[PDB]
Write a protein that binds this ligand. Structure first.
Ligand SMILES: [Cl-]
Ligand SMILES: [Cl-]
Ligand SMILES: [Cl-]
Ligand SMILES: [Cl-]
Ligand SMILES: [Cl-]
Ligand SMILES: [Zn+2]
Ligand SMILES: [Zn+2]
Ligand SMILES: [Zn+2]
Ligand SMILES: [Zn+2]
Lengths: 85, 81
């Protein structure tokens, strides 16, 4: 499945779910609590793919800095991708 | 391959290497610089998160994704007090 860690710059996508990386995943839990839920749009604002980290992503009107390991928990719908040019 | 994230509580093991999770892995580079090198002994002192691991006289509080990068020798495991 495509994850947020692979979302190209200036591109939005619809969140499908947030998958635990391991048992009792506090990071995954925190992401869900912050708005990363099925049906909501998330966009890659800066850094990543390429460039490096952190990945600056936006949900609603709030921006978060995520390591690739953190963004990889968020599964997005690849066919919902749209370039915000 | 056995990783530090799998080292049981109060058990020690010898580091084999540090594996990148992705290309251009800065965290992996930091671990290598921190002393997680081939031949060094690492001990799981607190949990089995956070995973508190000790190298020498330094205690590192690692998350599982960070510890999973550190590969250890399975035959080198030792139960400690
Ligand atoms: Cl976590
Ligand atoms: Cl990462
Ligand atoms: Cl990194
Ligand atoms: Cl983790
Ligand atoms: Cl990480
Ligand atoms: Zn993929
Ligand atoms: Zn990274
Ligand atoms: Zn740090
Ligand atoms: Zn974790």
């Amino acid at each position: 499945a495509m994850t947020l860690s692979e979302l190209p710059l200036h591109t939005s996508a619809v969140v499908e779910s947030v998958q635990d990386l391991h048992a009792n995943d506090a990071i995954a839990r925190r992401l869900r609590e912050l708005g990363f839920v099925k049906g909501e749009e998330v966009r890659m604002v800066a850094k990543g793919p390429v460039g490096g980290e952190p990945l600056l992503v936006q949900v609603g009107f709030t921006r978060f800095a995520l390591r690739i390991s953190e963004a990889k928990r968020v599964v997005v719908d690849a066919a919902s991708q749209e370039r915000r040019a």
